[PDB]
């Protein structure tokens, strides 16, 4: 009775938002950018290969200086690299070796890691002693942490597999905001450049636009047919790209509240592990699990290059702040910097 | 290179040496993933052999064991089961005293049928093609005391055999081992345990020595 009425109301609201997003769909992004100049071929080459990890890489993150990057691997290690000279600054031994995410603070004073222990551990790099010690162990999640991103030296947004994203206060150790709207496990995070709102791709084939201060979901994006493993904003902050297990990448517009372009090929039947945009937003770099990364034209949905060179599944990739280099991590325990 | 650059190179060399030593020490270790049902009973196994996941460390005859318990992970296991692709063995604990029971959640399957479905999912997974499974059949005393009253026809209706302890236990073991679709690149080791018995660590030691011999033969190229 009441449940049937609520289901009918939900179906009516879903049809209303579908009709509203259909009414604002006069043209398509492929048709508008059909008369722009295509980029020919992006031939990137491996400059530095970072060796030293002994198990599979699950996460890497760049620093804001575009030189220092941190990597996480299942050997219980968190290596901070100097990408210019290819040498190690720090080797952090983790209490739990089942790391699934890593983050680099914008100030560079801290790094984060987490995984199957359901704990976001924050490490102080710049101590009076020469070691890197654990600052905090944020423990309030039920499931495994999938992604963590730093807002400042005191705030960090974590995505977990217990169908929950959380915002933490590091000094207190408690969580201030609990983002609860999903249905499946949240697998990816992306912070906007202005650091006020973030998107989260989960296992219900949905991406939700959250508000950091308000704590409520603003938009829901339902175009995929499988588990979303990767998410990343456009540099403008008005769009983002998703990478799922149905071998497709999709670009979603925040203001139009729907999907603009699908980055798919018939020769690809394998999922996407990591996505990242270029500095200009023209190139979308997606790391697949057919052992290589594919460079996509973000305005024309055409492949511009292939970053072949990894012997196993490319699990993590990131583009620097200045856009000079792309570092790809994979399950063959190697990090390669492309330029 | 400057003086500070040379000293940074030396620091990186020291870090590399420490990483290599830790990697060799970890490669000489044995990693086990412990799996089972909620009512199958795994805490007695950890007690005999000694949120998030639980790591149990114990040393038996100059071998360092690492036992990982993922039973508290109430998430989609397809998104983290590849983290255990490199593992020496999987320990699957099945109580055979709950063939007559049913799940506390809902009645749509038996407990033994749920254990069989989990075994079929784990054994035939894409990440565990060459990973051996050590099978424990726990609570054999309750199974002996319950097979006299309740027959095994309740769980497996196509049994048609003697209702003794040995034939029923062998039929349960055969039904669990018949779900091994690979049967050519992995082995299933079966033990019958009980609470008042301290012999399970020896069984795990013998099985892991077999797995170590097979892995050394594979690394030598002889398989």
């Amino acid at each position: 009775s009441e449940l049937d009425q609520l289901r009918q109301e939900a179906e009516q609201l879903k049809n209303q938002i579908r009709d509203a997003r259909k009414a604002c769909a006069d043209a398509t992004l492929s048709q508008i950018t059909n008369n722009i100049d295509p980029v020919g071929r992006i031939q990137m080459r491996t400059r530095r290969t970072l060796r030293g990890h002994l198990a599979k890489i699950y996460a890497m993150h760049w620093g804001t200086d575009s030189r220092l990057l941190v990597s996480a691997s299942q050997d219980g290690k968190l290596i901070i690299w100097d990408s210019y000279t290819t040498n190690k600054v720090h080797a952090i031994p983790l209490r739990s070796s089942w790391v699934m995410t890593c983050a680099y603070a914008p100030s560079g004073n801290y790094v984060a890691c987490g995984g199957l222990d359901n704990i976001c551990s924050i490490y102080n790099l710049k101590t009076r002693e020469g070691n890197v010690r654990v600052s905090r162990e944020l423990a309030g999640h039920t499931g495994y942490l999938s992604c963590c991103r730093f807002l400042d030296d005191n705030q960090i947004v974590t995505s977990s597999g217990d169908t929950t994203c959380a915002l933490w206060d590091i000094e207190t150790g408690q969580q201030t905001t609990t983002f609860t709207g999903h249905t499946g496990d949240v697998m990816s995070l992306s912070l906007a450049p202005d650091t006020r709102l973030f998107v989260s791709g989960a296992c219900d084939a949905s991406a939700k636009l959250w508000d950091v201060r308000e704590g409520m979901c603003r938009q829901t994006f339902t175009g995929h047919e499988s588990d979303i493993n990767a998410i990343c904003f456009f540099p403008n902050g008005n769009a983002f790209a998703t990478g799922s297990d149905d071998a497709t990448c999709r670009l979603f517009d925040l203001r139009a509240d729907q999907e603009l372009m699908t980055y798919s090929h018939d020769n690809i039947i394998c999922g996407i592990t990591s996505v990242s945009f270029s500095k200009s937003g023209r190139l979308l770099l997606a790391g697949y699990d057919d052992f290589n990364c594919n460079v996509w034209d973000a305005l024309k949905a055409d492949r511009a290059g292939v970053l072949a060179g990894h012997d196993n599944r490319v699990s993590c990739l990131g583009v620097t702040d200045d856009g000079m280099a792309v570092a790809t991590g994979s399950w063959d325990s190697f990090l390669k910097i492309w330029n | 290179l400057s003086a500070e650059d040379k000293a940074a190179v030396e620091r990186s060399k020291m870090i590399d040496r420490n990483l290599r030593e830790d990697g060799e020490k970890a490669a000489r270790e044995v990693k086990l993933l412990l799996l089972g049902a909620g009512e199958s009973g795994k805490n007695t196994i950890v007690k005999q052999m000694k949120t998030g996941i639980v790591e149990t460390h114990f040393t038996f005859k100059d071998l360092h064991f690492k036992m990982f318990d993922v039973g508290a992970q109430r998430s989609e296991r397809k998104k983290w089961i590849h983290c255990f692709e490199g593992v020496t063995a999987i320990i699957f604990c099945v109580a055979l005293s709950d063939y007559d029971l049913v799940l506390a959640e809902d009645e749509e399957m038996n407990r033994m049928h749920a254990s069989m479905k989990l075994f079929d999912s784990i054994c035939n997974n894409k990440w565990f093609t060459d990973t051996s499974i050590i099978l424990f059949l726990n609570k054999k005393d309750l199974f002996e005391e319950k097979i006299k009253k309740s027959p095994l026809t309740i769980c497996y209706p196509e049994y048609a055999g003697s209702n003794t302890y040995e034939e029923a236990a062998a039929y349960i073991q055969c039904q669990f081992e018949d779900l091994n679709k690979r049967k050519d690149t992995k082995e299933i080791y079966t033990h019958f345990t009980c609470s008042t018995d301290t012999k399970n660590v020896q069984f795990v030691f013998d099985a892991v020595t077999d797995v170590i011999i097979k892995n050394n033969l594979k690394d030598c190229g002889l398989f």
Partner: single-chain antibody
Amino acid sequence: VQLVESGGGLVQPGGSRKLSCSASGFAFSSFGMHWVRQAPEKGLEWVAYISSGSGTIYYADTVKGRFTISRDDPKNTLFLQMTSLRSEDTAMYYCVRSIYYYGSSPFDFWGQGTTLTVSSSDIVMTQATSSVPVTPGESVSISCRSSKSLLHSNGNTYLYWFLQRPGQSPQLLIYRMSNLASGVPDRFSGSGSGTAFTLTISRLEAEDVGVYYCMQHLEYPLTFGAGTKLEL
């Protein structure tokens, strides 16, 4: 963090004496160690250096072949064995820690000091100013000049500034050119290009009066400069 060193005293010329430094408060194994001596009226002078892991050992030309530097990592102890002492070795000896990676702050902590008394192709860092009369609340620009260009090809200018208060060990202010050290107030600043440098203080209290030293870390043997005293 404290480096307490003991030993020395009154020794005859031609004798031998061992200086030991005890470290407590930091990871001793990950820090390179230095010995810096200072004559009773003169400035600082580098003596020796032992790297982390004891793989790289360097000596000054004055004490080469006669001084031995060693460390005891499990015991957190640094040793300096001196052989064939002269009257030129009469100095106060400091143990200095220095870590080396990208963005590190070498020469950050200095030990207390041991008074040793003995009975009777290098970059020349020049500080022409000496004993400048300074009133508080003003701005002071201490200048340093180098005989070689300290700007390396990697964009790093290895110029180190130190402040020695009277009766205290010297304290690092600026480690690389325009890099304020930890615990140093923002009034201190540093700038330069190539061989000419300056250290600018915006407004100064009675805390920052002493002898200001200039050091290069471009290449060994790490020559200092004669200090510029600031008196009230």
